[PDB]
Amino acid sequence: MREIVHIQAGQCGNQIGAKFWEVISDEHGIDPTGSYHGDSDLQLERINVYYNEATGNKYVPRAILVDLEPGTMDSVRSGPFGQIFRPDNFVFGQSGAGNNWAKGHYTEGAELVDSVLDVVRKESESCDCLQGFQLTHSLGGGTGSGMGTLLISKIREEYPDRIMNTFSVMPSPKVSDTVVEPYNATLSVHQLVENTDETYCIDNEALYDICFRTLKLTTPTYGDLNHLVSATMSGVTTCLRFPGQLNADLRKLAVNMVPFPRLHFFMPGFAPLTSRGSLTVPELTQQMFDSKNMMAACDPRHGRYLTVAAIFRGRMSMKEVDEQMLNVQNKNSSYFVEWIPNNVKTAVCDIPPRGLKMSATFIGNSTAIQELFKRISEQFTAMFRRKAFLHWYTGEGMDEMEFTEAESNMNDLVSEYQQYQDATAD
Amino acid sequence: KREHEREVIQKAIEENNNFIKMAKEKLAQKMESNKENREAHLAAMLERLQEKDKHAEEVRKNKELKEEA
Amino acid sequence: MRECISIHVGQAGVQIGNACWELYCLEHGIQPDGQMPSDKTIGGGDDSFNTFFSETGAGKHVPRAVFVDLEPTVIDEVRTGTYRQLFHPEQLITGKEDAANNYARGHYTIGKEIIDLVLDRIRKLADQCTGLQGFLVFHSFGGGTGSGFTSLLMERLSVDYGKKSKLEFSIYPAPQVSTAVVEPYNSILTTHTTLEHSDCAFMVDNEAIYDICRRNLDIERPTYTNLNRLISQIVSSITASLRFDGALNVDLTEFQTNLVPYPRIHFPLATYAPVISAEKAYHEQLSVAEITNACFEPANQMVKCDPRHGKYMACCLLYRGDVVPKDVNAAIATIKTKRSIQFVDWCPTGFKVGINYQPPTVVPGGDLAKVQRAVCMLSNTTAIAEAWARLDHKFDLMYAKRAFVHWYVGEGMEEGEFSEAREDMAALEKDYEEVGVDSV
Ligand SMILES: COc1cc2cc(c1Cl)N(C)C(=O)C[C@H](OC(=O)c1ccc(CCN=[N+]=[N-])cc1)[C@]1(C)O[C@H]1[C@H](C)[C@@H]1C[C@@](O)(NC(=O)O1)[C@H](OC)/C=C/C=C(\C)C2
Ligand SMILES: Nc1nc2c(ncn2[C@@H]2O[C@H](COP(=O)(O)OP(=O)(O)OP(=O)(O)O)[C@@H](O)[C@H]2O)c(=O)[nH]1
Ligand SMILES: Nc1nc2c(ncn2[C@@H]2O[C@H](COP(=O)(O)OP(=O)(O)O)[C@@H](O)[C@H]2O)c(=O)[nH]1
Ligand SMILES: [Ca+2]
Ligand SMILES: [Mg+2]
Ligand SMILES: [Mg+2]
Numbered sequence: 001m002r003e004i005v006h007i008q009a010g011q012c013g014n015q016i017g018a019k020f021w022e023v024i025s026d027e028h029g030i031d032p033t034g035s036y037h038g039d040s041d042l043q044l045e046r047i048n049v050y051y052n053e054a055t056g057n058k059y060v061p062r063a064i065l066v067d068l069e070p071g072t073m074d075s076v077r078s079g080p081f082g083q084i085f086r087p088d089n090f091v092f093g094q095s096g097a098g099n100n101w102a103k104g105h106y107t108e109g110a111e112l113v114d115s116v117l118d119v120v121r122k123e124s125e126s127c128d129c130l131q132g133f134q135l136t137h138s139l140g141g142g143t144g145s146g147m148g149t150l151l152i153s154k155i156r157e158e159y160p161d162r163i164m165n166t167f168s169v170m171p172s173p174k175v176s177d178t179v180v181e182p183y184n185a186t187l188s189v190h191q192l193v194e195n196t197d198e199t200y201c202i203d204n205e206a207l208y209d210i211c212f213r214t215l216k217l218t219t220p221t222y223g224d225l226n227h228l229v230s231a232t233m234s235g236v237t238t239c240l241r242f243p244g245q246l247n248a249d250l251r252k253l254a255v256n257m258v259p260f261p262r263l264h265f266f267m268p269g270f271a272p273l274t275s276r277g278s279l280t281v282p283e284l285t286q287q288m289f290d291s292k293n294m295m296a297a298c299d300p301r302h303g304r305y306l307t308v309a310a311i312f313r314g315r316m317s318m319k320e321v322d323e324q325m326l327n328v329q330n331k332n333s334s335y336f337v338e339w340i341p342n343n344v345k346t347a348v349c350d351i352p353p354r355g356l357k358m359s360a361t362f363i364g365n366s367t368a369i370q371e372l373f374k375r376i377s378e379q380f381t382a383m384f385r386r387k388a389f390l391h392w393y394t395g396e397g398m399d400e401m402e403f404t405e406a407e408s409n410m411n412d413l414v415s416e417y418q419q420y421q422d423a424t425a426d
Numbered sequence: 427k428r429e430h431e432r433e434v435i436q437k438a439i440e441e442n443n444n445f446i447k448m449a450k451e452k453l454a455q456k457m458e459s460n461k462e463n464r465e466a467h468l469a470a471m472l473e474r475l476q477e478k479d480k481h482a483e484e485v486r487k488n489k490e491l492k493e494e495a
Numbered sequence: 496m497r498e499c500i501s502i503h504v505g506q507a508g509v510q511i512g513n514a515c516w517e518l519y520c521l522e523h524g525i526q527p528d529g530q531m532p533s534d535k536t537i538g539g540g541d542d543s544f545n546t547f548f549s550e551t552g553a554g555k556h557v558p559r560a561v562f563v564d565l566e567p568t569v570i571d572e573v574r575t576g577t578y579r580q581l582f583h584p585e586q587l588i589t590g591k592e593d594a595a596n597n598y599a600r601g602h603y604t605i606g607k608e609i610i611d612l613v614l615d616r617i618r619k620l621a622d623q624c625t626g627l628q629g630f631l632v633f634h635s636f637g638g639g640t641g642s643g644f645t646s647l648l649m650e651r652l653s654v655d656y657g658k659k660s661k662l663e664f665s666i667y668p669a670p671q672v673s674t675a676v677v678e679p680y681n682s683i684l685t686t687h688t689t690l691e692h693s694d695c696a697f698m699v700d701n702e703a704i705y706d707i708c709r710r711n712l713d714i715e716r717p718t719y720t721n722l723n724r725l726i727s728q729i730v731s732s733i734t735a736s737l738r739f740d741g742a743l744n745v746d747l748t749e750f751q752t753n754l755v756p757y758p759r760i761h762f763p764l765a766t767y768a769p770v771i772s773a774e775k776a777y778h779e780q781l782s783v784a785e786i787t788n789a790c791f792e793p794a795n796q797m798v799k800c801d802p803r804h805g806k807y808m809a810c811c812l813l814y815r816g817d818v819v820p821k822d823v824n825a826a827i828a829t830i831k832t833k834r835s836i837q838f839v840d841w842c843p844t845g846f847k848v849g850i851n852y853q854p855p856t857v858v859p860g861g862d863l864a865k866v867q868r869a870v871c872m873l874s875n876t877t878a879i880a881e882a883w884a885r886l887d888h889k890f891d892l893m894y895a896k897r898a899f900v901h902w903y904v905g906e907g908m909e910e911g912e913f914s915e916a917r918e919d920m921a922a923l924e925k926d927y928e929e930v931g932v933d934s935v
Contacts, residue, residue: 002592105482106482107489110482110486129591129592153475153478156471157472160471160472160475194474195475249593252595254902255595255899256596256676256677258899259676259893259896259898259899307676318716319715339895339896340892340893341679341889341893342676342889343676345674395489396485397486397487397488397489397492398485398488399488420896423896425892425895442658445653445658446653446657449650450654452650453650453651457603460599460603461907464603464905464907467904467905
C-alpha cells in the first residue's frame with residue numbers, strides 16, 4: 001500500500017479539503033459513516049492510498065485538519081461528511097493569523113506546529129509505505145500561507161525522501177478585498193519553490209472568470225469556486241486512486257512532470273465546463289487545451305509546454321482518444337518544447353465523475369505560468385514600494401530584506417520559465 | 427606442446443577470474459560512490475532546512491527585543 | 496542437464512513471463528496445478544522440457560524461474576491468478592516501493608535493498624541444476640526496475656556465475672504504450688551498463704508489436720495482453736530448441752555461434768510469421784514458402800528498421816510444425832533471387848535452418864489463429880543500429896538541457912555516468928558501421 005497523508009490548513013484549505021473528501025468518498029462508495037456501499041471492486045482496490053481501515057469495515061480519511069481559529073473546522077465537523085474525519089486529527093488554535101503571514105509562519109503558527117507534527121507522525125508511522133503528503137491551502141491569507149509553508153518545511157525535515165504536493169489557491173482582487181494578499185502570496189511562493197516537489201496552481205482569478213464568463217454566474221460564491229476546485233482535485237488524483245498505468249503515484253507523476261526542480265508549478269484544466277441550465281472525444285480534447293478551461297489565469301498559447309498529463313474519465317474509445325491526443329499535439333507542435341520528446345502522457349479511467357458521462361482533466365507544466373507570477377509580482381511591488389502595512393510583518397520579527405528576497409526569488413522563477421521557453425534544440 | 431596446452435587453459439582461467447574481479451570492484455566503487463553522493467544531497471537539504479529554523483529563532487528573538495523596548 | 500533459468504524483472508518482464516509460462520504449459524501439456532499426465536517419470540528426469548521445468552516428488556512441474564519487482568501489485572496477480580500453484584512462493588519476490596521510472600532507484604536506492612535476496616533465490620534454483628547452461632532475463636528498457644535493477648542483477652550474476660551465458664529479452668520503448676518521459680535515459684543507461692555482461696539480447700520494439708497487432712490482427716488499440724501473447728510466440732520459437740527434441744532440431748547455442756561475430760555485436764533481429772486472425776486463416780493454408788517470404792517483409796520484424804538498407808552478418812530460420820527441408824530449401828532459393836539480401840564480404844551467405852516438429856500452440860481467448868507451421872527468423876543485420884540511433888537522438892535532445900537529470904543526481908548518480916553511457920552508445924553505433932564496411 002502506497003499511502004498519502006492529506007493536510008488542510010486555514011479557512012480556504014479546510015473548505016476545499018472538505019469538498020475534496022466529499023467528492024472522492026462518493027466516487028469510492030464511502031458514506032459519511034465510513035461504511036462502504038459501492039458496487040464496483042475498482043472503488044476499493046486502491047482505497048488505502050487515501051483511507052485508513054478501522055474496526056467495523058469503516059474507512060477513515062488519512063486527513064489532518066489545521067487552523068489557527070476554530071471557526072472553519074467547527075463548520076467542517078458540522079458538514080455532511082464531518083463525522084467521517086478522525087476527531088484526534090483536528091488541531092486548532094484560538095488566536096488566529098489575521099491574514100498575517102508572519103504570525104502564521106513565525107509566531108502563532110510556530111506555537112502550534114509541533115502539535116500538528118505529532119498527528120502527522122502518528123499517521124505516517126501506521127503507513128505500509130508512505131508516498132508523501134498533499135496540502136490544501138490558500139496563499140493570500142495567514143494560516144494556510146504562513147503556517148502551511150512552515151508545516152511543509154518541518155515535515156520535509158522528518159520525511160526528506162518523500163514527495164511534497166500542494167494544492168495552492170492563488171489570490172485575486174476579483175475575489176478578496178484584502179490588500180496584503182500579494183505579500184502573503186509572494187512570501188509563500190518563496191517557500192514553495194524550495195520545499196515542494198509539485199504544486200497545483202488553483203487561481204481564484206481563473207475560477208471567478210470561469211464562473212462569471214462561462215458559467216454565467218453574476219455573483220460567484222466561494223461554493224461556486226470550490227465546485228471547480230473539487231472537480232479539478234478529483235481529476236488530478238484519479239491516477240492515484242484507481243488502478244492504472246500512468247502517473248499512478250506521486251513520485252512517478254513528478255518524474256514525468258518536473259524537468260527542473262524549481263519548475264514544478266502546474267496549470268490545471270478541466271472539461272467540460274457547463275452551466276446548470278444551458279460531448280465527443282474531439283470536443284473533450286479541444287476544450288481541455290483551451291485557455292478558457294484552465295484553472296490558472298494563463299494563456300498556454302503565450303508560452304510553451306514542458307510536460308503535460310491528460311486524464312480521460314468515462315466509457316469511450318481509447319483509439320479515438322489516442323488519435324485526438326496525437327492530433328492536438330501535431331496541430332499545435334509550436335507550443336510543445338522539441339527538446340523533450342513525447343512530453344504528453346495520457347491516461348484513461350473507466351469510472352466517470354459524479355454527474356458526467358465523460359470528462360477530461362489537464363495537468364500542464366507550461367512556461368505561460370509566468371503570467372500568474374508576474375501578476376502577483378506586479379501587485380506586490382506596488383504595495384512594497386510604498387511599504388504599505390509593513391509594520392504588521394516587521395512587528396513580528398521580520399524585516400524588509402526577507403520581503404526583498406522573496407520578491408527576487410519569484411522574479412528569478414519567471415526568468416527561468418522564460419529561459420526554457422526561449423530554448424531550442426538547434 | 428603439453429606446455430602450450432597448459433598455458434592456454436591457465437590463460438582462460440586467468441581472464442575469467444580477472445573479469446569477475448574487475449566486475450566486483452567496479453560495482454563496489456559505484457555503490458559506495460552513489461551512497462556518498464545521495465547522503466551528501468540529503469545532508470545539504472537538511473542543512474538548508476535547519477538554517478531556516480535558525481532564522482525563525484532569530485525572528486522570534488527580534489520580536490521579543492522590540493517588545494522590551 | 497542443460498537447465499535454463501528465467502528471470503523476469505519489473506512489470507514488463509513479469510507480465511511477459513506470465514504469457515510465456517502459460518504458453519509453455521500448453522505446449523508441453525502441463526496443467527495449471529503443475530501436473531503433467533504424459534510425464535511418466537515422477538519427481539525428475541532428463542527430458543527436453545526439463546531444461547525449463549523442475550519436478551517435485553508430488554509430480555508438480557515447476558518453472559525454473561524467478562519473478563522480481565520492486566512493487567508488489569503485478570506479481571500479486573501471479574500469486575492469486577490462474578497459474579499460482581505453478582510457482583513456489585519463494586520464486587515470486589516483491590518490494591513495497593518501485594523505482595518510479597528512475598534507473599538510479601532501480602540500480603541503487605531501492606534495488607540495493609533486495610538484490611541479495613534475489614541472488615539467494617536464484618542460487619536455490621541453480622543448486623537444483625545438474626548442468627546449468629545459463630540465464631534468460633526479461634525486462635523493459637524504459638522502467639526504473641527493468642532498466643536499473645536488471646543492470647545491477649546482470650552485474651552481480653557475472654560475479655557469481657562467471658561467464659555462464661546470459662541472454663536478454665528487452666522491451667524497447669514506444670510512445671503508444673510508454674509511461675515515462677525519461678525512458679530514453681533509462682534505456683541508454685541500462686544498455687551501457689549491461690553491454691559487457693550479456694552474451695545475446697533480443698530487442699522487442701513495442702511499436703513494431705503494436706503495429707503488427709493493429710495491422711495483422713485487426714486490434715484497434717492493442718493492450719499489454721495483446722502485445723505479450725504475440726511476444727510469447729516469438730520467445731517460444733526461440734526457446735523451442737531447448738524445450739523439445741528432434742532430428743532436425745538445432746540448438747540455440749549453435750545459432751548463437753553464427754549470430755555473434757564480435758562480443759558487442761550481439762543483438763539479433765527477430766522476424767516472425769504467420770501472424771493472422773482466425774477469420775483470415777480459415778480456409779487459408781500458409782505454405783512454407785509463404786511464411787518464409789514473410790520473414791523478409793520489414794512489417795513483420797520485432798524491431799523497426801530497414802535491413803534492405805544495411806548488410807547481413809547472419810541469417811537463421813527457426814521453423815516449427817509441418818515443415819521439411821525440401822520445402823525450406825526451395826523457398827530459400829526463391830527468396831535469394833528476389834530479395835535485397837546483401838551480406839558483408841567477410842561472412843558466408845548460407846542460411847542456417849532448424850526445424851522443430853511440434854506444432855505451434857495458441858492460448859484460448861487469444862487473437863492469433865492456430866496454424867500448422869510457423870517460422871522465426873533471427874538475423875544479424877547492421878540495420879538494427881537504427882533502433883539505437885532513434886533512442887540516442889531522444890537522449891541527446893533532453894540531455895543537452897539536462898532535463899530531468901536532477902531526479903538521477905538526487906539518487907546519487909553523476910553526470911559523468913550519463914556521458915559515459917552515451918559515449919558507449921556512440922561507439923556501439925560506430926561499431927555497427929565498421930563491421931558493414933567491405934574489407935580492404
Ligand atoms: C485604509 O487602511 C486599511 C485599514 C484596515 C483594513 C484594510 C485597509 Cl486598506 N484592508 C481592507 C486591508 O486589506 C489591510 C489588512 O486588513 C486585514 O488583514 C483585516 C482582517 C480582518 C478585519 C475584520 C475587522 N477587524 N478590524 N479593525 C479587518 C481587516 C492588513 C492591516 O494588512 C493586514 C495586516 C498584515 C494584519 C491585520 C490584522 O488582521 N492582523 C494582523 O496581525 O495583521 C489586524 O488585527 C485584526 C486588523 C487590522 C485591521 C485594520 C488595520 C483596518
Ligand atoms: N510489451 C510489454 N511492454 C510493457 C509491459 N508493461 C510495461 N511495458 C513497457 O515497459 C516500459 C515501462 O517499464 P515497466 O516494466 O512498466 O517499469 P518497471 O520495470 O516495473 O520499473 P518501475 O515501475 O519504474 O519500478 C514502458 O515502455 C512500457 O510500455 C508489458 O506488459 N508488455
Ligand atoms: N477558492 C476558494 N478560495 C478561498 C476560500 N476561502 C478563502 N479563499 C481565498 O483565500 C484567501 C484568504 O485566505 P484564508 O484561507 O481565509 O486565510 P487563513 O484562513 O488564515 O489561512 C483569499 O484570497 C480568498 O479568496 C474558498 O472556500 N475557496
Ligand atoms: Ca519427469
Ligand atoms: Mg478568510
Ligand atoms: Mg513497476
